[PDB]
């Protein structure tokens, strides 16, 4: 199966672009990153920073994760992110999303050797 690190890159990294430039970005990316094959994933965030910059977050401020686990890390700097939120009329298989671009601190859960992001927890 996909490694946890590779799954995080597929589901949450978009280093190719600095921001989402179209209101259809989430419709396109949720589909193209295989997040709508099994069901419409209701919410997902993509990070528009280099992989190195996101991996570096695992060496930044330790915080709790929303589920109460304690291996989360908050970025020192804000990062470009796109939040994808499923619309009210969305119905599988035509999963439809609202795209919101913002510049916020991110919180990721980190694991492994090398110690890298494995879950996207939150932004603030």
């Amino acid at each position: 199966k996909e490694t946890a690190a590779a799954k995080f890159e597929r589901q949450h990294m978009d280093s190719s672009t600095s921001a989402a430039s179209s209101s259809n970005y989430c419709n396109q990316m949720m589909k193209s990153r295989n997040l709508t094959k099994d069901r419409c994933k209701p919410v997902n965030t993509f990070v528009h920073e280099s992989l190195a910059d996101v991996q570096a977050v695992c060496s930044q401020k330790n915080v709790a994760c929303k589920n109460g686990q304690t291996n989360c890390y908050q970025s020192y700097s804000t990062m470009s992110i796109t939040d994808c939120r499923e619309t009210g009329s969305s119905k599988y298989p035509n999963c439809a999303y609202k795209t919101t671009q913002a510049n916020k601190h991110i919180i990721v859960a980190c694991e492994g050797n090398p110690y890298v992001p494995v879950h996207f927890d939150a932004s603030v």
Partner: nanobody, 121 residues
Framework: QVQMVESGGGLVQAGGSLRLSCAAS????????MGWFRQAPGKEREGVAA????????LYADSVKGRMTISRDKGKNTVYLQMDSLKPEDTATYYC??????????????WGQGTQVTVSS
């Protein structure tokens, strides 16, 4: 960049008490969890004890519970392991770890190099 230091091991005798000490420096925040893991020759690394920054959330491996005590300085990235009566089965390399959750090895991102404890019996 973070300096993880842990110490206190060496050649020791069955029945003795032993204290291992660990500290992180070069980190500008607080590690919520710190703990101790160990690996005996030819065996899997195993969790020994962990504790959170408030001095709670304490957990021990079943085979060491009641025989060793973890502690931490409040407000600090330090952790300690007080071993009450060394057994032969306690021979291992002991590692301190920081920044994870409970005794989940993969969740910890900072590790000391390990201090060898060899128990004679």
């Amino acid at each position: 960049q973070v300096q993880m230091v842990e110490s206190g091991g060496g050649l020791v005798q069955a029945g003795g008490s032993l204290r291992l000490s660990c500290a992180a420096s070069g980190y500008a925040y607080t590690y919520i969890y710190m703990g101790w893991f160990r690996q005996a020759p030819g065996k899997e690394r195993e969790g020994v004890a962990a504790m959170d920054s408030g001095g709670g959330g304490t957990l021990y491996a079943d085979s060491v519970k009641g025989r060793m005590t973890i502690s931490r300085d409040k407000g600090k990235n330090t952790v300690y392991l007080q071993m009450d009566s060394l057994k032969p089965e306690d021979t291992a390399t002991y590692y301190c770890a920081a920044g994870g959750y409970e005794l989940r090895d993969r969740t910890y991102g900072q590790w000391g190099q390990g201090t060898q404890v060899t128990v004679s019996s």
